[PDB]
Design a protein around this nucleic acid. Structure first.
Ligand SMILES: [Mg+2]
Ligand SMILES: [Mg+2]
Ligand SMILES: [Mg+2]
Ligand SMILES: [Mg+2]
Ligand SMILES: [Mg+2]
Ligand SMILES: [Mg+2]
Ligand SMILES: [Mg+2]
Ligand SMILES: [Mg+2]
Ligand SMILES: [Mg+2]
Ligand SMILES: [Mg+2]
Ligand SMILES: [Mg+2]
Ligand SMILES: [Mg+2]
Ligand SMILES: [Mg+2]
Ligand SMILES: [Mg+2]
Ligand SMILES: [Mg+2]
Ligand SMILES: [Mg+2]
Ligand SMILES: [Mg+2]
Ligand SMILES: [Mg+2]
Ligand SMILES: [Mg+2]
Ligand SMILES: [Mg+2]
Ligand SMILES: [Mg+2]
Ligand SMILES: [Mg+2]
Ligand SMILES: [Mg+2]
Ligand SMILES: [Mg+2]
Ligand SMILES: [Mg+2]
Ligand SMILES: [Mg+2]
Ligand SMILES: [Mg+2]
Ligand SMILES: [Mg+2]
Ligand SMILES: [Mg+2]
Ligand SMILES: [Mg+2]
Ligand SMILES: [Mg+2]
Ligand SMILES: [Mg+2]
Ligand SMILES: [Mg+2]
Ligand SMILES: [Mg+2]
Ligand SMILES: [Mg+2]
Ligand SMILES: [Mg+2]
Ligand SMILES: [Mg+2]
Ligand SMILES: [Mg+2]
Ligand SMILES: [Mg+2]
Ligand SMILES: [Mg+2]
Ligand SMILES: [Mg+2]
Ligand SMILES: [Mg+2]
Ligand SMILES: [Mg+2]
Ligand SMILES: [Mg+2]
Ligand SMILES: [Mg+2]
Ligand SMILES: [Mg+2]
Ligand SMILES: [Mg+2]
Ligand SMILES: [Mg+2]
Ligand SMILES: [Mg+2]
Ligand SMILES: [Mg+2]
Ligand SMILES: [Mg+2]
Ligand SMILES: [Mg+2]
Ligand SMILES: [Mg+2]
Ligand SMILES: [Mg+2]
Ligand SMILES: [Mg+2]
Ligand SMILES: [Mg+2]
Ligand SMILES: [Mg+2]
Ligand SMILES: [Mg+2]
Ligand SMILES: [Mg+2]
Ligand SMILES: [Mg+2]
Ligand SMILES: [Mg+2]
Ligand SMILES: [Mg+2]
Ligand SMILES: [Mg+2]
Ligand SMILES: [Mg+2]
Ligand SMILES: [Mg+2]
Ligand SMILES: [Mg+2]
Ligand SMILES: [Mg+2]
Ligand SMILES: [Mg+2]
Ligand SMILES: [Mg+2]
Ligand SMILES: [Mg+2]
Ligand SMILES: [Mg+2]
Ligand SMILES: [Mg+2]
Ligand SMILES: [Mg+2]
Ligand SMILES: [Mg+2]
Ligand SMILES: [Mg+2]
Ligand SMILES: [Mg+2]
Ligand SMILES: [Mg+2]
Ligand SMILES: [Mg+2]
Ligand SMILES: [Mg+2]
Ligand SMILES: [Mg+2]
Ligand SMILES: [Mg+2]
Ligand SMILES: [Mg+2]
Ligand SMILES: [Mg+2]
Ligand SMILES: [Mg+2]
Ligand SMILES: [Mg+2]
Ligand SMILES: [Mg+2]
Ligand SMILES: [Mg+2]
Ligand SMILES: [Mg+2]
Ligand SMILES: [Mg+2]
Ligand SMILES: [Mg+2]
Ligand SMILES: [Mg+2]
Ligand SMILES: [Mg+2]
Lengths: 48, 170, 136, 96, 98
RNA sequence: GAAACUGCGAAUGGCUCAUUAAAUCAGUUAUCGUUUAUUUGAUAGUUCCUUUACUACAUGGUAUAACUGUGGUAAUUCUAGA
RNA sequence: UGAACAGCCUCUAGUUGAUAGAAUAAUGUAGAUAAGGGAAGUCGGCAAAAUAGAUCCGUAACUUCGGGAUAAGGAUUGGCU
RNA sequence: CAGUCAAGCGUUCAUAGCGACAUUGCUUUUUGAUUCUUCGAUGUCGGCUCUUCCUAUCAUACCGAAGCAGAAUUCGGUAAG
RNA sequence: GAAUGUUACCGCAAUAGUAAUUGAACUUAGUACGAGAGGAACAGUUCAUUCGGAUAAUUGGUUUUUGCGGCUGUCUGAUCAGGCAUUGCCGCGAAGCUACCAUCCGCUGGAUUAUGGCUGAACGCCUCUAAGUCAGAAUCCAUGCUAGAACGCGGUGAUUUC
RNA sequence: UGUACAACGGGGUAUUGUAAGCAGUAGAGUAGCCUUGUUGUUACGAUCUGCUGAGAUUAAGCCUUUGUUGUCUGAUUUGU
């Protein structure tokens, strides 16, 4: 769908930005439920 | 941050301490003199209305009504002015000062109760403290009792007992 | 970077390639700083080394006290101009490229830095935090 | 309050002011993944479980957002909600 | 997370947004976008640029309800008397006459 | 009689000789060309109001320090709210 | 308009002739812009950028005293009244 | 460019690291020697650009040895990822 | 892209390609070693370099959005609103494209080499080697990733009547 | 022949920076008629102010839609 910005406290003991705010970019994937409609079975063969 | 609450009807005052950023956040961007409905600050202060009167940020600099700005500034202060007592006749000084806009950079808010809620606050509503001194000028006595320029003061002036041990004085 | 820089540095946009000239910001007699190298830079066929805020370069003084001219000396970039971005997400830039002459250990040569300094430089060399007016 | 936080609180979804550009609105569940992803807007994507257990510490870090920008992406958006915009701007020649 | 404001146009500068400029005298100028930032670099005077806060404030535009009355007062009247001088005998002798 | 207010003083004293060459300085003028705390001597019956149903004169107003009490800062002859 | 037979716009007159249609890949030819640095590019600043009119102020070495000189360096410029 | 013998060098100690007098080789980015191919024409140097290959390895991985205390270094192995 | 009945969907995987690199700081630790002067490393953390694949929330660049505004010259009587100056010039400028000038991600198993060893004869002793065997490298084979043989393959859907 | 598709229209989101028109006791000022002004009057004057964050553009690869109008069987070929 798109991208946006996010702010959060970073939890990285030892880093100059431990317990500090960062802004990070994030994508957003639209994700409505998949509907199940079949099962498929696979067998192992010497050709794969 | 630390709230510094004053009950000026009782002369009472006591500091409370508030954690949790959402409870505080009610004061943010509120100016000095803006009233705040209490329940947002707690359930103990339900209904209580607090007028924002001042206070100090970290590093201890005072606020100063009228500046706006949720920042610090450095101003030229004069006699008869806040956050400055001059040392010398007609002396001005350039001193830092914190802005009248509340921020999380504050160590201490200063609040003044205006309307009392539905519940009592301990060291505040429950206790009451006496006005140290009483009237000294003539007409102020006649107006702290209502007497008309007939009643003669002398016996209406206050009288404070204090003891030598076995000699109690007046 | 390197010697006597206690600390790491998060990468920031490279604004000063070699041959750039930046205001000498201390009070030693030097007036500007001409970058001939970057310390700890890497190799790529045809890439100019470049300095960023808090880097340690090698400079020569182009305009300044004669007893300071015509010779190499370390220096620390204290102000950029090429806007970089911090991890709190701000894109910020100074008004001028500037640096202060220092020794390999990272102690300064003069006794003050005139103008502001970036924190990512003052956080990196103590003796710069010593002589820093306003930081960032 | 899809796009609200423990620290944001305000009722608002992830859809930016005037909606995801070249896309739409997001009216269903969604995955918000850090960074950028191969492929472009409207394209079928496959999110796949990892193939190894990463002790990265960088992966492992439990994260909680503070704030999710919901300003319009169609320009240099200045406002999160239409509420917020009206607050700052005032009443206009349309309007009340 | 502080939502700064544009030191030219007076808009909110939500996190990670716009530019920050650190002038010579060490004064910081936060711009929300390139528009204000270029207008700033142009020596343009925000009080002459119609769409800015600083212009609107100065020209008293749309303010209306802030110059409208409110209601924030109280009513006290409680007595304490004087410390060291019996707060009791300060309401009985305080029976007054006119 | 602490503190604090108020008043006066801190513009004298002491130090140096860098600038300064018609400047300073000096001797001699000028203020019919001006300011002057102080000291000393003088100097003030008039203040209200369409002018009988009068205006506190037997004396009109508050707002502050010190102080009490709640506080902030690593830090100053910092000072905030009550 | 402007110093002008310059450039740019117009009246008179005269043209509207030069295969056409659809797209706007790479690479080109011709026209442009680019943060920060600023010749580090290259045999070489090649190419490009910079400068530019006019009114005023200011102008070095050296010289065959004629120059060098728009030396260099500055400021100013609309409209309306 | 690499060996073999080992008189010597290396405080002592031939061979840790070296190595004379001799002697055996390898290589074909040296230069020669030759004149086979092209003189009815195989575009001459360098640079830019870009790929790939060799190893007689400069760095990086893991090792053996030292006249390797540590630190640094030298000799060597597997190694051209 | 013709032809292996037509057409469609979902897949297998032969062969081929393949990828990551290097450094510093903290800490270890002023430690082991040393008369001293000097002076490490393995584990852990934080970053960086060279490389690679993406990506465009942000910031930057680009501007025929000829979008809004502005300016010069002229032409439409003036007004409004416009034409022309090979896109007339200037400020701003969304969308798109795009930058270590921007952000994000860059997998872990086995088998070996050198080398150090185990057991152990040949050779009643001894020997890592002869038989057998352990541990081992930026190597190699996999895992992973990119093609998918247009003459390698499977599963499944529907399959025409005037 | 329908949570259909399209063209417009509406709403959102953007960009610029306040449209035209009208008004004004704003305006350096300037004319013209006297009944020569205890604002004389009628106009004119770059610009300013008000209605006006107005107007204008906004998918051409933005978002959205209970409205309006319209469209919905042409062609070719394929079998174990
Ligand atoms: Mg760090
Ligand atoms: Mg080169
Ligand atoms: Mg920059
Ligand atoms: Mg110091
Ligand atoms: Mg400081
Ligand atoms: Mg759509
Ligand atoms: Mg965008
Ligand atoms: Mg966009
Ligand atoms: Mg832009
Ligand atoms: Mg005094
Ligand atoms: Mg004196
Ligand atoms: Mg008062
Ligand atoms: Mg002409
Ligand atoms: Mg032709
Ligand atoms: Mg054509
Ligand atoms: Mg082209
Ligand atoms: Mg450039
Ligand atoms: Mg530039
Ligand atoms: Mg330059
Ligand atoms: Mg060169
Ligand atoms: Mg040069
Ligand atoms: Mg060259
Ligand atoms: Mg030459
Ligand atoms: Mg050369
Ligand atoms: Mg030549
Ligand atoms: Mg040149
Ligand atoms: Mg050339
Ligand atoms: Mg040229
Ligand atoms: Mg230019
Ligand atoms: Mg010359
Ligand atoms: Mg010039
Ligand atoms: Mg003028
Ligand atoms: Mg011999
Ligand atoms: Mg020996
Ligand atoms: Mg010997
Ligand atoms: Mg030998
Ligand atoms: Mg031999
Ligand atoms: Mg041979
Ligand atoms: Mg040969
Ligand atoms: Mg050779
Ligand atoms: Mg030959
Ligand atoms: Mg031939
Ligand atoms: Mg030929
Ligand atoms: Mg050829
Ligand atoms: Mg030829
Ligand atoms: Mg020995
Ligand atoms: Mg040793
Ligand atoms: Mg050493
Ligand atoms: Mg070995
Ligand atoms: Mg070996
Ligand atoms: Mg290789
Ligand atoms: Mg090979
Ligand atoms: Mg240590
Ligand atoms: Mg030591
Ligand atoms: Mg020793
Ligand atoms: Mg990507
Ligand atoms: Mg442009
Ligand atoms: Mg235009
Ligand atoms: Mg008009
Ligand atoms: Mg024409
Ligand atoms: Mg022409
Ligand atoms: Mg053109
Ligand atoms: Mg212009
Ligand atoms: Mg853009
Ligand atoms: Mg493009
Ligand atoms: Mg980066
Ligand atoms: Mg990259
Ligand atoms: Mg990584
Ligand atoms: Mg992988
Ligand atoms: Mg794996
Ligand atoms: Mg294997
Ligand atoms: Mg074994
Ligand atoms: Mg054994
Ligand atoms: Mg034997
Ligand atoms: Mg073995
Ligand atoms: Mg064996
Ligand atoms: Mg054997
Ligand atoms: Mg590897
Ligand atoms: Mg794969
Ligand atoms: Mg095949
Ligand atoms: Mg084929
Ligand atoms: Mg196939
Ligand atoms: Mg097969
Ligand atoms: Mg098949
Ligand atoms: Mg089949
Ligand atoms: Mg239609
Ligand atoms: Mg208008
Ligand atoms: Mg109208
Ligand atoms: Mg307006
Ligand atoms: Mg296209
Ligand atoms: Mg409608
Ligand atoms: Mg048939």
């Amino acid at each position: 769908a798109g991208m946006t910005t996010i702010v959060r406290d970073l939890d990285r003991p030892g880093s100059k930005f431990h317990k500090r705010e960062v802004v990070e970019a994030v994508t957003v994937v639209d994700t409505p439920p998949v509907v199940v409609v079949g099962v498929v079975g696979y067998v192992e063969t010497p050709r794969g | 941050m630390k709230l510094n609450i004053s009950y000026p009807v009782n002369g009472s005052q006591k500091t409370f301490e508030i954690d949790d950023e959402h409870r505080i956040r009610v004061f943010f961007d509120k100016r000095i003199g803006q009233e705040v409905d209490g329940e947002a600050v707690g359930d103990e202060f339900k209904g209580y209305v607090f007028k924002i009167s001042g206070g100090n940020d970290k590093q201890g600099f005072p606020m100063k009504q009228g500046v706006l700005l949720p920042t610090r500034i450095k101003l030229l202060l004069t006699k008869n002015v806040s956050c400055y007592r001059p040392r010398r006749d007609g002396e001005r000084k350039r001193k830092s000062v914190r802005g009248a806009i509340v921020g999380p950079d504050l160590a201490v808010l200063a609040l003044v109760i205006v309307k009392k809620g539905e519940q009592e606050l301990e060291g505040l509503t429950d206790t009451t403290v006496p006005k140290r001194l009483g009237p000294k000028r003539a007409n102020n006595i006649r107006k702290f009792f209502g007497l008309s320029k007939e009643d003669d003061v002398r016996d209406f002036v206050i009288r404070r007992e204090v003891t030598k041990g076995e000699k109690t004085y007046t | 970077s390197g010697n006597g820089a206690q600390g790491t540095k998060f990468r920031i946009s490279l604004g000063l390639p070699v041959g750039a000239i930046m205001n000498c910001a201390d009070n030693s007699g030097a007036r500007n700083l001409y970058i001939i190298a970057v310390k700890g830079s890497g190799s790529r066929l045809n890439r100019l080394p470049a300095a960023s805020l808090g880097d340690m370069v090698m400079a020569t003084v182009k305009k300044g006290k004669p007893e300071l001219r015509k010779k190499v000396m370390p220096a620390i970039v204290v102000r950029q101009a090429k806007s970089w971005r911090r991890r709190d997400g701000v894109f910020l830039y100074f008004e001028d490229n500037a640096g202060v002459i220092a020794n390999p250990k990272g102690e300064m040569k003069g006794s003050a830095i005139t103008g502001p300094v970036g924190k990512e430089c003052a956080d990196l060399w103590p003796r710069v935090a010593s002589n820093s007016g306003v930081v960032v | 309050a899809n796009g609200a936080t423990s620290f944001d609180r305000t009722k608002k979804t992830i859809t930016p002011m005037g909606g995801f550009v070249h896309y739409g609105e997001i009216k269903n569940d969604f995955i918000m993944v850090k960074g950028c992803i191969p492929g472009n807007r409207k394209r079928i994507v496959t999110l796949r479980k990892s193939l190894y257990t990463n002790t990265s510490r960088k992966a492992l870090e439990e994260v909680s957002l503070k704030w999710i920008d919901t300003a319009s992406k169609f320009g240099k958006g200045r406002f999160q909600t239409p509420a917020e915009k009206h607050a700052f701007m005032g009443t206009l020649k349309k309007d009340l | 997370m502080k939502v700064e404001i544009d030191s030219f146009s007076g808009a909110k500068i939500y996190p990670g947004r716009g530019t920050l400029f650190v002038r010579g005298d060490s004064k910081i100028f936060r711009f929300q976008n390139s528009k204000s930032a270029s207008l700033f670099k142009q020596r343009k005077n925000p009080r002459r640029i119609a769409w800015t806060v600083l212009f609107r404030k100065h020209h008293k535009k749309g303010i209306t309800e802030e110059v409208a009355k409110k209601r924030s007062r109280k009513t006290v009247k409680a007595q304490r008397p004087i410390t060291g001088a019996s707060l009791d005998l300060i309401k009985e002798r305080r029976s007054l006459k006119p």
